């Protein structure tokens, strides 16, 4: 009885946890280029005149 | 994925009527885990929102499937009489795997001008979307070359400089190896390896170049997260320009 | 079944962390390398004459 | 890795017509972790974006792979009648450790030279890159020398000056110990060590002097951050220019 | 538990490859062990 | 059973041409109860895909 009704649900909480990491992954590598960016920009304002 | 290197930008300077290709580079994130990048399961999306540009998927070909024997000794130049064989993969040995590279982006686009042409003789495709060559006389003969977007790069063959004009159709993306690559032949890249990421511009894309404007670029394998990249591009300032 | 789901987003939680100290190291680099060369150019400019 | 030296550079001065080689210094940062410096698995690339320079990947060789017994007393040099064995290779012991580095990048080209030479002789290698001689007669009757890249160094022995003219084919780089180094055999740099990186350009790249450019290196070990050096250029003012 | 390689399996190191080891009693689960192998550093490396 | 050390891993250094011997450690998970490992009955597989 017990043995399926379980696995069903470990099977959902998996790819609930695998989304969020997708998610995380993606996104952190977004906003660290965009510090890259940023600190770049940074370093040329200070330096141009 | 991350991003591994600077990206950059090719623009027709100082005259910046025109786009000819952007490079980066790209290896598996903090080395745990190795990524299929063959470009029937991968896309690579690029986009240039101000303008409307939206490409969903620009990947056709990649050069990890390559291995050096069909591409060595392949392509030859002709200096008056004399003529000379160009090695274009290079490769080194550690612990019994052969390592394969490509040195610069001017090698990858010869090897992939021969491995197309090749593929199109072997009927396996249709019609290669890049052409190059080193003599323009052939042009006049060929008007389809007239139209599409055109860029040229130098090699150097018996300490002479060989100038290539490199015709591109439409606009694509090709992957090669840079370094830490032993599976020459398979489209995978392994945790520790460095690959080579380039854009070539068709005549649509190529139009004028960006300016005050964001571009992004998207690559999706087939399993794991895909690598966001997002610049907003000032003016160019040089024949090659760093914008990332 | 939580053994597994909070296991996924470690993974991913430490690989985000990991891509962030990859680009402020990097960044780093580059950017004190910038002063360095800075400081020998305002060193020139002051002693040339 | 962080630059631990100034960055080294040098041309045809006066004449400044054609570039020869840079040198830098490395260290891990901090004395924190060890970094793997294998040719096979790190790329170092170079761009001088101003001109369209772009190099994916130009390490090819290090010496931290040779042990001291391989290079010295293997190169010898003719004064007269009398034939004198170089050592090139120095070391030191402390705790049992044999610690081993290069004085000079002189004794550094010298000690590759042997190893690439030796290398294509066991056939482990299909061509040397670089060609080292004392005597410039040799040349006549190697006229593939004649075409690429050519600089001169000089080192004393037995109190006299020897002149050594070092032929180069194509840009490339290589890593060599210089202090704090006891894993000879390994090319691991561990914590506390010092690793000097020399670039050698080819006819290429040589052409002419960089001027009023932005030069780029990176090194991009297979774990962990990479290093970005990044120097604008103005004229050089000695045989070796300081950049960086 | 100690592994050790005969000439077969000792003839080149493992480097850039994954090497997945099983225990398996005859009660009970299986341990599964798996390491992907850098380039070993020393005469002992530690990969997992 | 649990792995409970680090895995160790022996070759012919510098020259990694030749590999030696593996060592780890494991013992029974939580505590729980005893696990047999006699060699008639036990199997250990060994994989390099
Ligand atoms: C790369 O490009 C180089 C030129 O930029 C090439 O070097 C030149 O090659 C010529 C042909 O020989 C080579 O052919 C193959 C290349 O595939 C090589 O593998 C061979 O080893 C061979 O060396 C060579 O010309 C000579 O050979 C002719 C017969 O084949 C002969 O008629 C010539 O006289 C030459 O001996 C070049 O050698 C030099 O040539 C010049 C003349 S020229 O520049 O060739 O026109 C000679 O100068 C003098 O010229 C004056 C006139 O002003 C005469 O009065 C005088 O009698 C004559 O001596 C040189 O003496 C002679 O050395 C050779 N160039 C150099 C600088 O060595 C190279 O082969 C190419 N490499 C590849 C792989 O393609
Ligand atoms: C990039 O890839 C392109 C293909 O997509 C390459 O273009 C092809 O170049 C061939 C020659 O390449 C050699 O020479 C060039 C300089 O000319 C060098 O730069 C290269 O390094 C290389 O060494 C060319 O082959 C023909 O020209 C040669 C002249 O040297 C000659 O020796 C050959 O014998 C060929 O005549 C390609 O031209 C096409 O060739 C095919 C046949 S094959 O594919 O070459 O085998 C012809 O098809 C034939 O058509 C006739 C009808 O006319 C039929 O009867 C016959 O059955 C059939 O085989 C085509 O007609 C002919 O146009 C040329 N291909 C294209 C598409 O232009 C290019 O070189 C690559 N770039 C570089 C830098 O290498
Ligand atoms: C980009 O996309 C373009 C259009 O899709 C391509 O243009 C077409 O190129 C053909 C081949 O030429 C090139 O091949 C490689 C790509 O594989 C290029 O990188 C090179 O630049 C190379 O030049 C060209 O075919 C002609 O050249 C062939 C040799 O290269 C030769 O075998 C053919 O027989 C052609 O002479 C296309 O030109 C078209 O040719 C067809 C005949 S065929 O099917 O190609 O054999 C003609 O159809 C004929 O039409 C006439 C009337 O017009 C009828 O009477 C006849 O019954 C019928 O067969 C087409 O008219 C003619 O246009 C050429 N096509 C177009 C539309 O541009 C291009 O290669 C792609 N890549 C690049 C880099 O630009
Ligand atoms: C780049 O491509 C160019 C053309 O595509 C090549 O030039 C052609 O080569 C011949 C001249 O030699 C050239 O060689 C050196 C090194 O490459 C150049 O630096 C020189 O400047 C020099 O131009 C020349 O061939 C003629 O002579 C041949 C015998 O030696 C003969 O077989 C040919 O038929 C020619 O008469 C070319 O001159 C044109 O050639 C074409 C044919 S092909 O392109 O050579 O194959 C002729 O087309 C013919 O036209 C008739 C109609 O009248 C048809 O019936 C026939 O079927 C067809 O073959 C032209 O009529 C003729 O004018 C010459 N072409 C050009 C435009 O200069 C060049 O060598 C290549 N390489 C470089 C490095 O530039
Ligand atoms: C480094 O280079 C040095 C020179 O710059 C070398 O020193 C000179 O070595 C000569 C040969 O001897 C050496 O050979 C090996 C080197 O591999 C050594 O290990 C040996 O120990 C040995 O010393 C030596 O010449 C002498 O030996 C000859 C027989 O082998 C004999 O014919 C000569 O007469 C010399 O004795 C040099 O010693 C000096 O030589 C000069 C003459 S010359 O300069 O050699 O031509 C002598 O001067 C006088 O010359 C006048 C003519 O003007 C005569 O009238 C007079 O009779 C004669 O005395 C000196 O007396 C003699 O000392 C020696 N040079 C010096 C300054 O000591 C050295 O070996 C090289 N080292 C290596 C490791 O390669
Ligand atoms: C940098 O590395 C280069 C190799 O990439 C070195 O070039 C090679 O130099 C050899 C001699 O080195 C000694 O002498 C020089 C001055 O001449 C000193 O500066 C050095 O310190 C060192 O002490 C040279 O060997 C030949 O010349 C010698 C003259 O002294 C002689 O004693 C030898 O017996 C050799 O004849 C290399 O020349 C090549 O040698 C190989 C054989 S081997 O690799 O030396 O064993 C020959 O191959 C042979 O070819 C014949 C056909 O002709 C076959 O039948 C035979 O089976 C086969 O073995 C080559 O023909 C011959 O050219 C020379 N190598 C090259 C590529 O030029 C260079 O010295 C290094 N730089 C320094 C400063 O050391
Ligand atoms: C840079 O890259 C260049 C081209 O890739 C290299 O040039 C080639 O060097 C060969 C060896 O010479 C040098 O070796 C080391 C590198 O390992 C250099 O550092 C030294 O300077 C050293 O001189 C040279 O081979 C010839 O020299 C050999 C001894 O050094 C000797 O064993 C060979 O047999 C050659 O005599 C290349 O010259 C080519 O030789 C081949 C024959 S082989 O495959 O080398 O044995 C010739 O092929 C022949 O071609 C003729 C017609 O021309 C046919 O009849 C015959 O059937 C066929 O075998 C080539 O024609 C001839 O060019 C030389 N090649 C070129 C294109 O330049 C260079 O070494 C690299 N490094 C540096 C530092 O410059
Ligand atoms: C640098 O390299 C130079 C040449 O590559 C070397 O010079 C050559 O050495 C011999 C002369 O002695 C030299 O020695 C001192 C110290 O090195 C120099 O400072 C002096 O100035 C002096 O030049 C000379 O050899 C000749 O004599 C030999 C007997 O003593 C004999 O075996 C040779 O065959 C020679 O006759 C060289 O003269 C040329 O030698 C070459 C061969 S080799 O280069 O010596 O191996 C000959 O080539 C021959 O050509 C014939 C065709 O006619 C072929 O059939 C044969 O197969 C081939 O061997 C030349 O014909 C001949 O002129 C001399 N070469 C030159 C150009 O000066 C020099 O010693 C080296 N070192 C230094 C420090 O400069
Ligand atoms: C490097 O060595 C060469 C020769 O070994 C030196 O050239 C000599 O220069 C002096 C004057 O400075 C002349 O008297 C000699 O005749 C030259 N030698 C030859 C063989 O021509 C050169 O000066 C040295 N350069 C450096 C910077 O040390």
Do not use: C, H, R
């Given at each position: 009885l017990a043995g399926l009704d379980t696995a069903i649900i470990l099977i959902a909480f998996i790819i609930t946890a695998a989304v969020l990491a997708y998610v995380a992954v993606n996104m952190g590598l977004f906003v660290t280029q965009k510090a890259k960016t940023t600190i770049n920009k940074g370093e040329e304002t200070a330096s141009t005149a | 994925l991350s991003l591994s290197g600077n990206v950059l930008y090719a623009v027709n300077?100082?005259?910046?009527?025109?786009?000819?290709?952007?490079?980066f580079t790209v290896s598996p994130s903090s080395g745990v885990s190795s990524v299929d990048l063959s470009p029937s399961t991968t896309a690579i999306s690029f986009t240039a929102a101000s303008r409307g540009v939206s490409l969903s998927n620009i990947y056709q070909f990649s050069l990890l499937s390559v291995?050096?024997?069909?591409?060595?000794?392949?392509?030859?130049?002709?200096?008056?009489?004399?003529?000379?064989?160009?090695?274009?993969?290079?490769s080194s040995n550690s612990a019994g795997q052969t390592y394969v590279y490509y040195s610069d982006p001017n090698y990858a686009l010869l090897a992939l001008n021969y491995t197309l042409?090749?593929?199109?003789?072997?009927?396996?495709?249709?019609?290669?979307?890049?052409?190059?060559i080193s003599n323009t006389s052939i042009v006049a003969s060929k008007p389809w070359l007239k139209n599409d977007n055109?860029?040229?790069?130098?090699?150097?063959?018996?300490?002479?400089?060989?100038?290539?004009?490199?015709?591109?159709?439409?606009?694509?993306?090709?992957?090669?190896?840079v370094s830490g690559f032993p599976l020459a032949g398979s489209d995978?890249?392994?945790?520790?390896?460095?690959?080579?990421?380039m854009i070539l511009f068709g005549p649509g894309e190529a139009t004028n170049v960006?300016?005050?404007?964001?571009?992004?670029?998207?690559?999706?394998?087939?399993?794991?997260?895909?690598?966001?990249?997002?610049?907003?591009?000032?003016?160019?300032?040089?024949?090659?320009?760093?914008?990332?």
């Open positions: - | 300077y100082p005259t910046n009527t025109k786009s000819y290709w952007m490079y291995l050096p024997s069909q591409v060595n000794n392949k392509v030859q130049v002709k200096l008056g009489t004399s003529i000379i064989n160009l090695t274009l993969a290079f042409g090749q593929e199109v003789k072997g009927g396996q495709l249709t019609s290669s979307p890049l052409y190059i055109v860029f040229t790069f130098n090699i150097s063959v018996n300490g002479t400089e060989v100038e290539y004009y490199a015709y591109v159709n439409k606009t694509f993306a090709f992957t090669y190896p995978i890249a392994p945790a520790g390896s460095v690959i080579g990421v960006f300016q005050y404007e964001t571009v992004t670029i998207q690559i999706t394998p087939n399993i794991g997260s895909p690598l966001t990249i997002s610049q907003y591009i000032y003016q160019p300032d040089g024949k090659v320009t760093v914008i990332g």
